[PDB]
Symmetry: C3
Subunit: 313 residues, 3 copies
């Protein structure tokens, strides 16, 4: 089949930015600050089922491509941009584990047995152990020659793994992942300021919002480090809507689907903050960012399921 | 008038380093550690009135230059060194707001109504949103080609705004400004170590002392992060008196007036520290740095008001 | 004597990595987590006496070389690699002060009179004030042209001095040294990621483990910053055994003696952690790293005292 050679690894962004929506809707349904919203816990279940189906689809499709044409993911893995998209097949699974619907989780049973944390973070941790080792000892694939805004996709995995580790109960593994995540977020942040794409340049917002969420999941509250990182993420989000006013052009692509993952985590951190600092301005900010990320995911969805059908119908 | 084209933006340093003295004298008059000093609260009022008069003078003079010869501040704004001096016309106003004399503040009235924070930090926050956005997406004005010791003047604004926000009561805006200030202080600090002027090379001390003061104003006490930043500032101050022994030469200029702003904030942070850790060695250190910054401001003043009169008398 | 001109400054690593073993054995004998180990406090005393004898030997030998052939340590000091080994003659003394045997310390007497902190950290602090000043104002010896993995030897001194300052009682000097240590560890860490030796490339582990130990000595417990730095050090240790599997080759040298100092501090931080978080996996990790660093020091020792005798016997 000649279709599989044209199947990209960036198609996992469609599932990343769609399973990160199940988490946001679960938060909006369970947060005791957005309780004026008469939101149902059924929306989270529907979005999560859609995300899991999409993940299974683009995972079996990619397993077929990897087992049939192995020279193709080798050309896709030795790229400066498309090597960081090999973390999304595991971040998209950690985002399904974190946002498991309450109606679907076993009642009066095991609270997310930690096997789902290991089985999902080990393939990310090994790839990260290789990439972070190449960032030093690499000759041609050193960080100073590869550093791009899509390099934040290697770091986000650590904070999402910390959230999942906090969920499963292993708090110390969460602290380990958060430490090795911030230690390299500092490096990437400083190395990207020395050295304009619309969708993928916005990964500057997904790493600090995730670092704020992971610290609030590990340690119970939003204790000034979650706040430091969240306010850094909010400034990076505010300084991004200003350059690209939102009128970049008629562009709706699979790469544009990784324009929703940073906005959704930045809308989730602010929901946690609005339930941590219950003002009116903070609640309105969380309600604005949430309805701004959700509507973009919705339009991308009704656009994709349109192009998909009007291909040859 | 041909005088206005030769009027520099760096003349706002004369007001920055003179309104930062009203704050130091207010601290020396109100700190319950320097109470052996029989200092009067009238010195703070006199210095603050002088600073406000100087600010009004060099602000009306600069408004006239900007509204008459607009091609001049365009040549002054597109400079690597003189673009960071566009933050001082607002930091010098925040330093008047923070150090309002107790005798002049309305008794039994509003405690610094937060309009003075917005009206004074908005023009700084917009310019900062533009500069920090250019540090990434700029072609010729990127940070790696502009980074100089005077680039710390973009960061100090955040910490001074955090102090003012803590004063007006909006603590969360203070935390926001402190977060977006430290996030870029790390970048500037690391980018200035890769790549010797006497007065302006000393901006390495004004940013950490201000970051220590802002954290102590936001959170009530001097809780180990104020201490980390203050000790970093003290080491940078100690490692500066050693290179330039203080005998750089017979040099007393308007650029030398931005040699007092870093020393004054580093003398203010140590007053806060001496009232936080009440030893003898700490009190003597605060009393040494205070009398070392104040005497330099005094000699610069009696030198400037001398050249000013002996021009043509 | 023609032998002295061939005497290297890196010979102080033999004492650094051997006096850092007295501390590890004292910890293993005094930690209330490794109490299943029937370890004796006599092993710490024996190792400390050996370390002090070696230090006196290679210090008198080097004083003779410095006072006889002064043109040689000038050629050794103006090197990019061998200028950072001028901190080890003081870190090796701070490691004797920190790990003084309990049987040898005066009972019911002064608790490490702080003169041993000043007399041992002043020669390090002056050299550090010079090197850190050159990292900015240097023309040919700037950091961007000198930064190598052995540059972490300038930073470790700060954290070891913080531990010693906490021991002697001067906690605020410890906080000062920790602040000026982390401020430059961030710089070195970020500047080494832009720009493979076996023994000296492993200094990436000695600085964060020491920064974790210093924060736990200053502030009583292992409070999440010690944990952040220790987990960063543990990841850097885990990502180092993987590249060099431990089979680099038949190499046992004086430079290989500075392959034990990072592993020993990383085995000491994990002993502190295992006494802070008393699980089984953490205790086994501390017992693994300890018996992995100690056996390497032991084999290096029985190898050195073999080559030394079989030279000409
Ligand atoms: C083993 C080689 C790797 C070394 C790094 C280990 C991480 C820190 C060790 C501390 C041990 C400890 O004591 O804590 C770790 C915890 C047990 O503690 P807890 O139940 O969470 O504490 C109590 C908190 N309650 C009360 C809330 C429950 O179990 C673990 O998560 C095991 C970690 C598995 C490996 C994690 C490494 C990360 C890479 C993932 C590879 C699959
Ligand atoms: C709005 C778009 C900008 C997004 C960034 C907002 C900052 C954080 C929001 C948290 C809201 C909150 O809940 O706190 C913010 C506080 C209200 O809380 P508080 O009274 O201080 O808490 C109680 C503490 N007491 C008990 C001590 C009093 O009000 C504000 O300062 C409004 C902030 C105005 C905008 C600040 C943005 C900075 C740029 C300046 C532009 C003029
Ligand atoms: C002097 C020019 C250098 C400026 C930097 C000074 C460091 C911070 C000053 C705070 C003073 C203070 O108040 O604390 C410092 C302490 C006294 O406090 P403490 O007993 O530990 O607190 C009580 C804690 N207990 C209750 C547990 C005991 O004494 C000192 O360690 C003096 C420091 C000597 C110089 C340190 C500079 C580092 C370079 C080393 C050069 C030899
Ligand atoms: C780039 C190398 C250094 C990387 C690390 C930089 C920052 C490390 C510490 C940041 C996170 C620690 C925040 C402190 C939290 C408090 O101590 C409380 N214990 C929170 O529980
Ligand atoms: C350059 C990218 C990362 C920038 C951020 C680096 C450091 C971020 C945290 C430093 C400040 C947090 C200090 C922690 C304070 C404690 O948690 C207490 N809650 C203080 O109230
Ligand atoms: C490179 C320039 C910036 C360097 C500093 C970066 C991090 C500075 C703060 C890290 C250490 C502070 C951790 C905070 C501890 C808590 O506030 C508690 N008070 C601990 O006692």
């Amino acid at each position: 089949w000649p279709f599989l050679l044209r199947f990209p690894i960036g198609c996992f962004g469609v599932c990343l930015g769609l399973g990160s929506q199940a988490i946001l809707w679960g938060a909006l349904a369970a947060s005791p600050a957005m309780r004026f919203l008469r939101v149902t816990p059924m929306i989270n279940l529907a979005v999560w089922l859609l995300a899991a189906a999409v993940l299974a689809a683009t995972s079996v499709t990619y397993a077929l491509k990897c087992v049939f044409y192995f020279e193709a993911i080798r050309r896709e893995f030795f790229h400066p941009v498309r090597v960081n998209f090999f973390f999304t097949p595991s971040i998209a699974a950690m985002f399904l584990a974190i946002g498991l619907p309450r109606a679907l989780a076993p009642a009066d049973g095991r609270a997310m047995h930690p096997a789902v944390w290991c089985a999902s973070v080990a393939p990310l941790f090994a790839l990260e152990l290789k990439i972070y080792g190449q960032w030093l000892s690499g000759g041609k694939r050193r960080l100073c020659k590869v550093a791009n805004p899509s390099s934040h996709l290697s770091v986000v995995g650590n904070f999402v793994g910390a959230i999942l580790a906090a969920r499963v109960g292993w708090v110390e593994a969460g602290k380990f992942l958060w430490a090795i995540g911030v230690a390299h977020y500092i490096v990437v942040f400083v190395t990207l300021y020395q050295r304009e794409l619309h969708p993928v340049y916005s990964m500057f917002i997904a790493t600090p919002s995730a670092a704020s969420l992971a610290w609030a999941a590990i340690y119970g509250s939003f204790d000034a480090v979650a706040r430091t990182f969240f306010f850094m993420a909010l400034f990076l989000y505010m300084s991004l809507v200003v350059r690209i006013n939102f009128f970049r052009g008629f562009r709706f692509s699979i790469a544009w689907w990784s324009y929703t993952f940073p906005m959704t985590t930045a809308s989730l951190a602010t929901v946690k903050y609005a339930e941590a600092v219950p003002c009116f301005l903070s609640r309105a900010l969380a309600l604005s960012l949430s309805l701004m990320s959700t509507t973009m995911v919705s339009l991308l969805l009704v656009s994709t399921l349109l192009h998909a059908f009007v291909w040859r119908s």
